[PDB]
Design a protein around this ligand. Structure first.
Ligand SMILES: *[C@@H]1O[C@H](CO)[C@@H](O[C@@H]2O[C@H](CO)[C@@H](O)[C@H](O)[C@H]2NC(C)=O)[C@H](O)[C@H]1NC(C)=O
Ligand SMILES: *[C@@H]1O[C@H](CO)[C@@H](O)[C@H](O)[C@H]1NC(C)=O
Ligand SMILES: *[C@@H]1O[C@H](CO)[C@@H](O)[C@H](O)[C@H]1NC(C)=O
Ligand SMILES: *[C@@H]1O[C@H](CO)[C@@H](O)[C@H](O)[C@H]1NC(C)=O
Ligand SMILES: *[C@@H]1O[C@H](CO)[C@@H](O)[C@H](O)[C@H]1NC(C)=O
Ligand SMILES: *[C@@H]1O[C@H](CO)[C@@H](O)[C@H](O)[C@H]1NC(C)=O
Ligand SMILES: *[C@@H]1O[C@H](CO)[C@@H](O)[C@H](O)[C@H]1NC(C)=O
Ligand SMILES: *[C@@H]1O[C@H](CO)[C@@H](O)[C@H](O)[C@H]1NC(C)=O
Ligand SMILES: *[C@@H]1O[C@H](CO)[C@@H](O)[C@H](O)[C@H]1NC(C)=O
Ligand SMILES: *[C@@H]1O[C@H](CO)[C@@H](O)[C@H](O)[C@H]1NC(C)=O
Ligand SMILES: *[C@@H]1O[C@H](CO)[C@@H](O)[C@H](O)[C@H]1NC(C)=O
Ligand SMILES: *[C@@H]1O[C@H](CO)[C@@H](O)[C@H](O)[C@H]1NC(C)=O
Ligand SMILES: *[C@@H]1O[C@H](CO)[C@@H](O)[C@H](O)[C@H]1NC(C)=O
Ligand SMILES: *[C@@H]1O[C@H](CO)[C@@H](O)[C@H](O)[C@H]1NC(C)=O
Ligand SMILES: *[C@@H]1O[C@H](CO)[C@@H](O)[C@H](O)[C@H]1NC(C)=O
Lengths: 49, 99, 453, 371, 50
């Protein structure tokens, strides 16, 4: 979805250095402030918040 | 990390109850397995032959190892060109998680 | 072992330099027996191709055969494949009509050629079309055979690439004549780039129809395979000056430099098979079925550092193709050379050759210079995973100098974006012009530096 | 005033009928002074000496068309290849008459070859039609022979282009292997049960034994094969009720030879209308120059339509094949091949017989066990 | 009114430049103005052009 849109490719060139594999490891990384933001599906985030 | 560690496991929650509702309504049994990685599935070129591949859930689907994907499956144009979808059951968007 | 190199050619190149091509060659002898016999011939009939082959097989059981040619007969490769299937002798083709590609081999056949398949050349042509973003094209193929596999290979190649090939439906021809419905299908072409698969006899009629239907325009491109563009001498006047073809007949790589590699391939395969099986000489007794062969063994080889590996189908892994054009002097220029696995070109500045025939005058190509600025002209490298400027970016070139001891540099193709790029795209939408974009290498915006801007 | 015609034919007793058909070719075709000259050569156990005997005879004899037919070779290759190669070196039309290998369809390999018998790939031209008859929309294609089975699979996918459907699963493997049950056990889990097979006899016996030992020949397992899979010991090991095809006038060689002679005769009398009658020279002695009007003479031979003979309505397509052949649909009624339907050029016409399926009743098994 | 170019026809028999001028046309409605002897040839060319 961020690869198709030609005006959102730059963030793609950020996220190619930082993408992860599971949601829970990203939750733990942003939980201890190892990350600083997390773009994700709204239902999973509204559940875990 | 794990070369081969597959044990029988207990799966439950939302979509499992959806599948139980479908097997209650439509007359069929099933056998739930999971995917062999942690990827939904994208459109990636393999090393040679100039050929695209789909990995993940579409990878185990289009290889014939599955017949129905019941998952948080995001509907887009690319997957719908290759597999058919049903009508959605839960609507969302995209947002940010902060502290 | 005993290896014979027979050469059938009317262009008289002597045979004693082949004996000179054996002394310092293979100085580190890995086999225990290397012997060569060089023979010349001026006849190419199959009677000689049976009789002299049986004589050389009776001539101390020659295990290696290398044949070259200068004619245009592809049935020689059809004969030698059957002879290699019957005699259990690895036979190699070099040039002329002997190196022309045949489709399906036999598992009992050990015959091999120095040439590229129609699929590999289709891959090269589509790489050319990808490097110029010629995404809107068509396909005009006649009923000359191999065409169904060619169309199927193109349709499988389109659905497995990050390009997004706009494919107009494949116009096919009934006969070589100017039929009614074939002319109707040819008039439906409104695109520019045309992949034209036909024979040398058909091309004159097809391009005469193209001039008769206005398909030889200054924007209309034409890309053809190797079989239609054969002899460098016989080029008819019905070809447009600006036709691009691909053929591996390089003028630098001569016949001796190729047989010098082929003999090394044969000796390397025999010496490596000696490491696994002992009895390397296994030949047939007389013209009038072993197990250990070199057919299933020489998958890879590295002679003189050059990679010369083979495939399961019986082709070359790395064939040395040459991308030629037809310039305004009605000649064939060595324009593009093939890289390691990728493709390089010399003319990144693509020349017009705007008049294909004598009189095609037009004024819709524009040369546009610009300069890198942070909100307007953002110039970045091409996306390496796709090799494609994505559709907000446009192609451009920059003469980046390699070193500063000399003035040599490369016109590297890059991607432009920003604010003025959208302005130029909307101008090309409205005013409907063809534009060429390039960065400046002289310097900044402008200053009258001693009456020189 | 002479036309040389070469013959590369199996037996000496059919040569008399060949010469009789040559004599009848100039019989009703007017008082024109053309002559037809015959030369017949037979089997050789060695393959290079076949072409060695053919070349200096027929090329020096300046033949225009060569009729080649050799069924009774104990070698299982069945290759008239070197005669066709030698005559295609100078673009001389070899007309194959008995062999049916699909390697001859590629005219990029056989540059001037024509044939009057259909190859096995056009059996697929019936099979899609079978899918049109008994409501079959999900088939399982199995290919053993990798030589011509790629062309058969390509022809079936060409016939499935208009419907825009495919098979459920296609499988290919090594011709000659034995441990083939791993393909069938993965074919067991498929929901459809219509099974179509293309194989040779040495693989047909193996896959019949594999389907017998897995009990994959019972109810629902509908089979559909061709002519190779119903001959040899494969007919002995055949599962009961199998549906195959039989060539009408396919094994009757002499009537097909006479029909081919009539075809060549009307083609020559049609070509004599045009001028520029060039001759293929003595190419065996030094003459490397090929015959100039090769493709012209071949294109004359392409669009020739006929209405007389035992074959009768014989016509050649864009590939130079037998247009609209007649196949008798055969069923294995208690290990006895019974004709249970015919097929002319466009559509399957059933007879009044009973189609005993490999499973149970005579009603068609809709073998779509949706899981 | 969204108007395309003014396509003129010198001769319908030259079949090279005027055919390119007809290839420029991709709009829906076309106003035609010629003589009766020429309209047969013009529409016969435009039929094969689709
Ligand atoms: C084959 O035999 C049939 C027997 O009637 C011929 O008749 C045609 O059969 C097809 C079957 O689909 C029909 O669609 C046609 O309408 C029939 N034609 C007529 C006028 O009866 C058929 O002509 C025979 N030959 C061919 C072409 O294979
Ligand atoms: C599962 O995960 C780890 C890491 O992949 C693996 O080494 C091991 O087999 C398993 N250990 C646990 C925690 O069950
Ligand atoms: C449901 O499935 C069972 C098992 O296949 C079958 O026997 C039965 O007829 C079906 N009954 C219903 C309620 O549809
Ligand atoms: C190519 O293969 C190697 C070895 O399996 C692997 O490391 C690499 O990621 C592959 N590249 C891709 C994904 O095309
Ligand atoms: C090659 O040409 C020469 C000169 O004309 C001739 O003597 C010879 O017969 C030809 N080749 C052979 C070996 O027959
Ligand atoms: C060539 O092939 C062999 C296998 O026979 C392989 O082990 C080797 O790596 C290849 N050559 C090199 C040096 O890469
Ligand atoms: C390029 O050549 C190198 C050897 O210089 C070798 O790795 C390979 O054959 C080629 N492929 C790559 C890595 O581009
Ligand atoms: C340009 O000149 C500089 C001087 O230091 C040199 O380092 C560089 O290699 C030269 N080449 C280029 C990149 O133009
Ligand atoms: C020339 O340029 C290349 C790439 O910048 C560099 O590796 C090389 O050292 C340069 N040579 C000199 C002497 O400038
Ligand atoms: C024509 O026919 C005879 C019949 O025996 C055959 O032997 C020979 O090839 C031909 N002879 C002539 C007259 O050329
Ligand atoms: C084929 O392979 C499987 C592997 O388990 C084996 O069980 C079976 O007996 C084999 N069949 C034959 C005929 O070799
Ligand atoms: C024969 O068919 C039956 C059907 O249930 C099956 O149980 C059995 O395994 C089959 N025989 C063999 C040896 O596969
Ligand atoms: C072959 O056909 C001919 C002509 O009808 C006939 O004379 C001959 O008996 C047939 N042979 C058989 C029995 O197949
Ligand atoms: C024969 O070929 C020549 C080639 O120029 C042609 O001019 C001539 O008309 C042809 N003759 C006939 C009537 O076939
Ligand atoms: C096939 O059958 C039709 C109808 O009888 C006939 O016209 C045609 O000649 C037959 N072809 C053969 C194989 O003789």
């Amino acid at each position: 979805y961020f690869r198709r849109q030609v005006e959102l490719s730059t963030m793609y060139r950020h996220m190619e250095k930082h993408n992860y594999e599971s949601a829970a490891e990203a939750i733990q990384a942003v939980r201890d402030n190892k990350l600083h933001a997390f773009i994700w599906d709204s239902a999973v985030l509204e559940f875990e918040a | 990390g794990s070369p081969r560690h597959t044990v029988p496991q207990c799966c439950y929650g939302f979509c499992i109850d959806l599948l139980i509702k479908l097997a209650r309504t439509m007359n069929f049994t099933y056998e739930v397995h999971l995917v062999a990685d942690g990827k939904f599935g994208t459109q990636e070129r393999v090393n040679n032959s100039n050929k695209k591949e789909w990995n993940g859930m579409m990878g185990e689907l289009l290889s014939g190892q599955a017949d129905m994907i019941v998952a948080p499956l995001t509907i887009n144009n690319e997957r719908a060109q290759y597999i058919e979808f049903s009508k959605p059951f839960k609507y969302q968007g995209l947002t940010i998680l902060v502290k | 072992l005993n290896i014979a190199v027979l050469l059938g050619h009317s262009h008289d190149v002597t045979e004693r330099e082949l004996r000179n091509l054996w002394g310092p060659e293979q100085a580190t002898g890995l086999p225990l027996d290397v012997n060569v016999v060089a023979l010349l011939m001026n006849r190419t009939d199959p009677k000689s191709l049976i009789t002299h082959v049986c004589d050389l097989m009776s001539g101390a059981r020659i295990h290696g055969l290398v044949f070259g040619d200068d004619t245009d007969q592809e049935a020689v490769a059809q004969m030698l494949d059957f002879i290699s299937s019957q005699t259990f002798i690895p036979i190699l083709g070099i040039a002329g009509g002997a190196s022309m590609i045949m489709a399906d081999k036999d598992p009992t056949s050990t015959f091999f050629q120095f040439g590229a398949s129609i699929q590999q050349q289709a891959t090269v042509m589509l790489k050319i079309m990808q490097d110029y973003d010629w995404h809107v094209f068509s396909l005009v193929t006649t009923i000359f055979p191999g065409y169904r596999d060619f169309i199927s290979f193109i349709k499988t190649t389109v659905d497995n690439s990050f390009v997004g090939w706009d494919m107009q439906n494949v116009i096919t021809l009934d006969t070589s004549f100017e039929d009614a419905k074939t002319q109707v299908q040819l008039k439906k072409i409104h695109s520019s780039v045309i992949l034209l698969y036909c024979s040398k006899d058909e091309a004159v009629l097809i391009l005469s129809e193209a001039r008769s239907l206005g398909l030889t325009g200054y924007d209309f491109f034409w890309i053809v395979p190797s079989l239609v563009s054969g002899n460098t001498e016989l080029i008819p006047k019905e070809f447009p000056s600006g036709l691009i073809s691909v053929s591996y007949d390089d003028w630098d790589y001569s016949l001796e430099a190729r047989v010098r590699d082929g003999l090394g391939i044969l000796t390397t395969a025999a010496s490596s098979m000696l490491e696994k099986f002992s009895y390397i000489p296994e030949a047939k007794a007389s013209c009038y079925t072993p197990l250990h062969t070199l057919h299933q063994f020489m998958v890879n080889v590295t002679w003189d550092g050059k990679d010369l590996s083979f495939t399961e189908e019986g082709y070359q892994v790395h064939p040395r193709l040459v991308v030629i054009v037809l310039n305004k002097d009605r000649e064939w220029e060595k324009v593009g050379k093939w890289e390691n696995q990728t493709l390089s070109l010399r003319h990144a500045v693509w020349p017009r050759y705007k008049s294909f025939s004598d009189c095609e005058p037009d004024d819709n190509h524009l040369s546009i210079v610009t300069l890198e600025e942070a909100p307007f002209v953002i110039v970045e490298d091409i996306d390496p995973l796709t090799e494609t400027c994505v559709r907000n970016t446009v192609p451009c070139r920059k003469f980046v100098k390699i070193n500063n001891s000399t003035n040599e540099g490369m016109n590297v193709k890059k991607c432009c974006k920003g604010f003025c790029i959208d302005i130029l795209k909307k101008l090309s939408r409205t005013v409907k012009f063809t534009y060429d974009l390039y960065l400046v290498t002289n310097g900044k915006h402008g200053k009258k530096v001693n009456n020189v801007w | 005033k002479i036309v040389n015609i070469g013959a590369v034919l199996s037996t000496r007793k059919h040569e008399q009928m060949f010469r009789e058909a040559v004599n009848q070719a100039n019989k009703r075709h007017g008082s024109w002074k053309i002559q037809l000259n015959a030369t017949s050569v037979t089997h050789k156990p060695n393959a290079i000496q076949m072409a060695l005997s053919v070349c200096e005879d027929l090329i020096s004899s300046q033949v225009y068309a060569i009729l080649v037919s050799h069924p009774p070779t104990p070698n299982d290759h069945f290759t008239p290849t070197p005669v066709s190669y030698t005559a295609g070196f100078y673009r001389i039309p070899v007309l194959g008459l008995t062999t049916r290998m699909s390697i001859y369809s590629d005219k990029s390999i056989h540059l001037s070859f024509l044939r009057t018998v259909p190859p096995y790939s056009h059996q697929s031209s019936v099979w899609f039609e079978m899918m049109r008859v008994y409501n079959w929309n999900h088939i399982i294609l199995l290919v053993s022979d990798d030589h011509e089975g790629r062309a058969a699979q390509k022809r079936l996918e060409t016939l499935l282009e208009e419907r825009e459907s495919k098979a459920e699963k296609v499988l290919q493997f090594d011709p000659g292997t034995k441990n083939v049950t791993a393909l069938l056990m993965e074919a067991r889990e498929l929901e459809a049960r219509v099974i179509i097979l293309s194989a040779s006899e040495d693989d047909a016996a193996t896959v019949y034994r594999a389907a017998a030992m897995l009990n994959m020949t019972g109810s629902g397992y509908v089979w559909l094969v061709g002519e190779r899979e119903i001959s040899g010991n494969a007919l002995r090991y055949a599962p009961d009720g199998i549906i195959g095809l039989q060539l009408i006038n396919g094994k009757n060689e002499s009537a097909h030879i006479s029909d081919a002679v009539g075809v060549v005769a009307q083609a020559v009398h049609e070509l004599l209308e045009k001028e520029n009658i060039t001759d293929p020279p003595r190419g065996c002695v030094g003459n490397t120059n090929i015959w100039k009007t090769g493709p012209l003479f071949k294109r004359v031979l392409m669009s020739s339509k006929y209405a007389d003979g035992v074959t009768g309505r014989v016509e050649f397509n864009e590939d130079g094949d037998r247009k609209f052949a007649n196949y008798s649909i055969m069923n294995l009624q208690n290990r006895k091949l019974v004709q249970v339907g015919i097929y002319n050029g466009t559509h399957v016409i059933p007879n009044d017989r009973k189609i005993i399926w490999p499973g149970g009743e005579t009603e068609k098994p809709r073998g779509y066990q949706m899981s």
